[PDB]
Structure 1
């Protein structure tokens, strides 16, 4: 046993309360280094005949990545207090892993050797609005969805679909267009709409805000926003807006003042100014988003900027009943502001989804005192490298999925915002080099994956394009030009997702085929329900053996409806190039 590979520390993904009386403990060890692991646990104050009263609970291996095995165990301390450690077995060898280090036999003359989870508290629990977990989102870039109102469209707005978007072009897309097509989305199966910035800004993306309390004229007005939202509610479709609090635009009144009045400005402390007077050349003398002079960074530590953004956050909630906030560049704003943002928001409307845009490991913002979830880009990376780019093996793809998942606690993973693309990346059909077969696979895994998936407008009907701005082409409404194959495929899966809970709340695990090269086999398990998926990731037909205890096992093909049983010789599924298949497993 390699001690140096064994690790556990009382927090985040390793130790957390799942509910008011249940604790989740996770242990990490070198892959296949340990035969079995058992959690040694007991209440820190229970001592009889002058000896601590602890108990042994076997831990379950939940997954493996490139280097480790991860073990799980849920416990319900008698009086909500718990001291604990781990006993590892491998051959006649035995190791006891504690906070005090490794031992070869359970020490018992003292409870200080052990890791400790002081107490379970309802208020410190992590809790995201539960509805989000059964929602399938639709990300829309207004300027490119549908010009429902040709009168407010910006001047110069080129004919719909005329040519490719430029970082500065316009096509008159607006809030009405969204309202005008809700029928298309309801049909598709969408139950949530995430809109990129829609407030006042000179650009076509609106990330350089000029007025947070004003819907941008070229989209509509407050009256129009209410109608879209209200109308969305009736069709059972939650709405979420993008909140750009990290930075303002070159035309944000408070900034224009500093720009003109210098250090005497009443707003000079609303930004990160290094010295006056403000200057743009050679380069800004103030902080900005990246190195964009048009996007000056706001000082969320300044009490007035804080009070301002909180009000902006509660205004649209209180007055328009939005269901969520997509915090743009959320990781660049202080944890303190985020802690207040959650208090203000949740007090006003508890079930509002607070989603942070963090392009990397986000454990620090996901401890229940800040964001409910964060856009899962690591997910996108992994999924695209395997299904679209075919760069990594099935085995590896399984290790990456297992890795990222075990990086956060279960209750966090259940509310994750899984996306395959957005207005910040190339189109998936394009990443797939135009191969619709590969894409269908992307949609399959995303829709069979636990969390809160989000589809980028057009993706369902095969829209193409490279990275920004090529990915922001005008939505395709002409049927003779939109892929019907994909559309029904996505409509098909969104459906199966609703019928099978295990598909949206289930635990996931990968089965190993002798050839973990192109064959990916995994299964979701809500606990009761149990779906199995098999995907042939290769351009050639394949006979994939499907491992499963044939004793009292029945499968139900979720595509055809067909059904059948399993015997001594476990059935072998045949799939065409890039074929897949979903089976519902029943144990009788």
Structure 2
């Protein structure tokens, strides 16, 4: 056994409470290096005859990535306290992995050797708003969704979809246009709407805010937003707003004051200024988003800034009842500010989904004291690499999916915001090089994946375009311009996701298929139901061997409803180029 590959540390994704009485424990070892792993556990104060009392619970291998196998075990501590270790087996070899290193036999003269999960507290528990688990979000870039009020459009607005957007072009999209098309979303199956910035700002993206307490006049007014939200709730749709708290706009009043009065300004400490007076040439002498002069970084450590942003955060929730906050550039704002943000948001309305824009590993913001989730761009990346660009095998794709999933606690992955693209990425159809077949697979995987998926407006009808701003074309409403194959496909999948619980909250496991280069086989199971998905990611037709049991197994095709019994061990499914099929399993 390779000790250098064995790992566990009593926190994060390796040790956590799943609920008020259950603890989850993981361990990772070198792939195929260990035959079995047993969790050694007991109450740290349970002694009898100078003998610490403990038991052995075999751990289940839940999956493996490129280098390791991940083992799982849940345990309900009798008195919510626990000391534990890991006994690894291989041939006649035996190893007791503990906090004090490895032993060859369970030491029991003391508990100090073992890892420790001191006490299970409801208060430290990770818990996200349960309703996001069954939600399928839809992202809207207001300036480009629908012009439902031509009079408020900024002069200079281009004719709808008359051309490709530019960093500064305008087409007149507004909040009214969203309301006018809600029926289109309801029909599609959407139950969540995520809006990019809608507060006063001079840009078409509005990430450079001028006033956080004002709806941009070009999108509408407060009454209009209130209607949109209530109109959404009427249809069972939740609404999430974008919080651009990392930086403000050049026209934010406090910043405009520091700009004119320099260091004497009462707002100078609301920012990160290196020298006075402030200047943008040759480069900003104050911290900013990226290196954008028009986007001054806010000082969230400043008591004033903190109170202002927190008011903003609570204002739109108490006055408009929004259901979520998407934290723009969340990772660049301090943790201290986020703990307060959460406390104040969750105290005002527990159901508010706190989503942070973090494109990378975000474990530190997902411990339960801060965000409920982050935009899963690592998911986006892996899925696109397999389905759109085909630059990795089914084998490597499975490894990457298992790797990112095991890097977080189970309850964290259940609330994850799984998107395929956004206003900051190129259009998926364009990443797929125009191949609708590939996009169908992307949507298939996303909608059969545990979490809270999000659809970028236009992706469901095949809109095209490279990265920002090309991905921000005006929403295509002309029926003859929308791709019906996709729309019905997406609608179908969302409806399936709603019917089968294993698709939105279950466990995913990949089954190795011969020619693990193009054939992707995986299943979702929540213990009650099992859905098997088979995907032929190749340009040729394929006869994919379904690795299942013979007599007793019955399958139901989810899309066609056809029911049939499994012959023997020879169940070969035939699929056309880039074809796929979903089956509900049954063992009698």
**SS of corresponding position for 1:582:** strand
> What SS class does the counterpart of residue 11 from structure 1 fall into?
coil
Structure 1 Cα separation of the partners of residues 392 and 451 of structure 2: 23
Distance 1:354 1:405 in 2: 20
Post-superposition shift, 1:568? 2.4
CA distance in 2, matches of 1:105, 1:448: 44
Aligned equivalents of 1:568 and 1:444: distance in 2? 28
Q: Spell out, residue by residue over 1:488-511, the C-alpha distance to the aligned partner (whole angstroms, 9 max, x if none).
A: 000000000000000000010000
Deviations 1:415-472 (A, max 9, x none): 0000000000110000000000000000000000000000000000000000000000
**Residue 174 of structure 2 corresponds to which residue in structure 1?**
174
1:550 deviates by: 2.3
The C-alpha deviation readout for 1:282-301, integer Å capped at 9, x for no partner, is 11110000000000000000
1:49 deviation in Å? 1.1
In the alignment, the residues of structure 2 paired with residue 367 and residue 236 of structure 1 have an alpha-carbon distance, to the nearest angstrom, of 29
- CA shift for structure 1 position 552: 2.0
CA separation in 2, counterparts of 1:295 and 1:570?
A: 62
User: How many Å separate the matches in 2 of 1:189 and 1:537?
Assistant: 27
Match for residue 432 of structure 1? 432
Taking the aligned partners of 2:541 and 2:548, their CA distance within structure 1 comes to 22
**SS of 1:481 mapped into structure 2:** coil
Q: Secondary structure at the match of 1:520?
A: strand
Q: Is the 8 A contact 2:548 2:569 kept in 1?
A: no
User: What is the CA distance between 1:542 and its match in structure 2?
Assistant: 0.2
Instruction: Give, in angstroms, the shift of residue 570 of structure 1.
Output: 3.4
1:102-152 per-residue CA deviation (whole Å, 9 max, x = no partner) reads 000000101100000001011110000000000000000000001000000
Q: CA deviation at 1:275?
A: 1.2
Q: Which runs of 5+ in 1 are unaligned?
A: none
Structure 1 residues 301-356: Cα deviation after superposition (integer angstroms, max 9, x where no partner): 00000000000000000000000000000000000000000000000000100000
Determine the C-alpha separation between the residues in 1 that align with 2:405 and 2:505.
Answer: 13
Structure 1: distance between partners of 2:567 and 2:116: 47
TM-score by length of 1: 1.00
Distance 2:274 2:219 in 1: 36
In the superposition, the TM-score normalised over structure 2's length comes to 1.00
Q: CA deviation at 1:526?
A: 1.3
CA RMSD in angstroms comes to 0.5
Distance 2:85 2:490 in 1: 46
Structure 1 residue ranges (4+ consecutive) displaced by more than 3 angstroms after TM superposition? none
For the residue of structure 2 that corresponds to 1:178, the secondary structure is helix
**Whole-Å Cα distance in 2 between the matches of residues 143 and 226 of structure 1?**
18
Distance in 2 of aligned mates of 1:218 and 1:282: 33
Q: What is the DSSP-based 3-state SS (H/G/I as helix, E as strand, rest coil) of the residue aligned with 1:479?
A: coil
Check whether the contact 2:438–2:578 (CA below 8 A) recurs between aligned residues.
yes
Deviation at 1:583, TM superposition (A): 0.2
User: Distance in 1 between the 2:570 and 2:131 partners?
Assistant: 38
Aligned-pair CA distance for 1:571: 1.2
Q: Is contact 2:547-2:569 (8 Å) kept? A: no
Measure, in 2, the Cα distance between the counterparts of 1:21 and 1:565: 41
SS at match of 1:52: coil
Q: Please tell me whether the aligned partners of residues 549 and 569 of structure 2 are also in contact (alpha carbons under 8 angstroms).
A: no
Partner SS state of residue 310, structure 2:
helix
Q: Deviations over 1:375-429 (max 9, x none)?
A: 0000000000000000000000000000000000000000000000000011000
**Counterparts of 1:350 and 1:76 in 2: how far apart (Å)?**
26
- How far does residue 551 in structure 1 lie from its aligned partner after superposition? 3.7
Superposed CA offset, 1:43-84 (max 9, x none): 001111111111000000000000000000000111111100
C-alpha distance in 2 between matches for 1:11 and 1:580: 39
Using the TM superposition, give the Cα deviation of residue 280 of structure 1 relative to its aligned residue in structure 2, in angstroms.
Answer: 1.1
Name the SS of the counterpart of 2:535 in structure 1.
Answer: strand
2:139, 2:193 within 8 Å by CA — same for their partners in 1? yes
Which ranges in structure 2 are unaligned for 5 or more consecutive residues? none
Deviations 1:255-283 (Å, cap 9, x if unpaired)?
Answer: 00000111110100000001111111111
Q: CA deviation at 1:567?
A: 3.2
Structure 1 counterpart SS, 2:319: helix
Q: Hey, what does 2:474 align to over in structure 1?
A: 474
- The question of 1:559 aligning with 2:565 is answered no
Q: Match of 2:497, SS?
A: helix
SS at match of 2:568: coil
Give the Cα separation in 2 of the matches to 1:264 and 1:569. Answer: 80
The corresponding residue for 2:68 is 68
**What SS is found at the alignment partner of 2:397?**
helix
Contact 2:23 2:76 in 1 (8 A): yes
Cα distance in structure 2, aligned partners of 1:314 and 1:135: 23
Q: In the aligned structure 1, how far is the partner of 2:569 from the partner of 2:430?
A: 41
Alpha-carbon distance in 1 for matches of 2:484, 2:55: 58
Measure, in 2, the Cα distance between the counterparts of 1:34 and 1:565: 36
Cα shift readout 1:146-178 (whole Å, capped 9, x = no counterpart) = 100000000000000110100000000000000
Partner of 1:550: helix, strand, or coil? Answer: coil
Partner deviation per Cα, 1:354-379 (whole Å, 9 max, x = no partner):
00000100000000000000000000
CA distance in 1, matches of 2:334, 2:47: 45
Deviation at 1:587, TM superposition (A): 1.6
Equivalent residue, structure 1, for 2:232: 232
Deviation readout 1:187-219 (Å, 9 max, x if unpaired) = 000000000000000000000000000000001
Question: What is the CA-CA distance between 1:14 and the residue it aligns to?
Answer: 0.1
Aligned residues: 588
Q: Quote how far apart the aligned CAs of 1:96 are.
A: 0.5
CA contact (8 A) 2:558 2:583 kept: yes
SS in 1 for 2:108: coil
